[PDB]
RNA sequence: GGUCAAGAUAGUAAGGGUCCACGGUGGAUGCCCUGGCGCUGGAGCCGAUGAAGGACGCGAUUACCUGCGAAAAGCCCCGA
């Protein structure tokens, strides 16, 4: 999900979570410019997930520092 | 009526002229507003927490614009 699946997980996972999200994003690219990339959405969605992840580790790391 | 004689005037337009009909060119005029212009009133500073203003980037296809900043036409929270 968007709220309930990120803040339950710890950041040492986030680093390599980011990492794998990237990796798939990259292979996706290679596909795209190789053709055909029949599911363009998946790209932007992975973007969305990434932005989520970082927003999360950020707000969190700074709210645990209270 | 044919010949000859004397004398007179017609029509053709290569082209042009005036008018008429019919288009072409051009974009005046009328209408319209998606843009202005002034007056009244309101509001009036930004920035070392990086300003105004940019450069390069972010798109399934992206040259211009717009939005954005490698979390990149967007990301989290609340409210309509
Ligand atoms: Mg002639
Ligand atoms: Mg631009
Ligand atoms: Mg909302």
């Amino acid at each position: 999900m968007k709220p309930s699946e990120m803040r339950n997980l710890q950041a040492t996972d986030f680093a390599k979570e980011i990492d794998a999200r990237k990796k798939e994003l990259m292979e996706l690219r290679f596909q795209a410019a190789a053709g055909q990339l029949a599911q363009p959405h998946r790209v932007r969605q992975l973007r969305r997930e990434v932005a989520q992840l970082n927003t999360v580790k950020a707000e969190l790391a700074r709210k645990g520092e209270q």
Side-chain angles (χ1 to χ4, degrees):
Chain A
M1 286 281 327
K2 277 205 156 203
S4 60
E5 223 209 311
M6 339 286 291
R7 298 87 163 247
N8 305 0
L9 315 192
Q10 341 292 352
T12 341
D13 206 14
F14 284 172
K16 117 168 193 303
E17 267 287 1
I18 282 177
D19 193 274
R21 223 114 286 189
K22 287 274 195 286
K23 173 185 174 194
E24 192 179 306
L25 194 262
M26 162 215 152
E27 296 170 341
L28 272 154
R29 295 188 305 244
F30 281 59
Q31 284 207 4
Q36 199 59 284
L37 194 84
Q39 284 158 13
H41 72 264
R42 183 68 190 156
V43 188
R44 250 172 39 250
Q45 173 215 140
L46 259 117
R47 154 177 286 96
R48 169 185 303 274
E49 279 194 22
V50 161
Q52 286 186 55
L53 259 118
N54 274 270
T55 333
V56 165
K57 206 190 80 198
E59 285 179 341
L60 282 213
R62 296 274 279 164
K63 234 197 318 196
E65 295 161 20
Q66 284 183 4

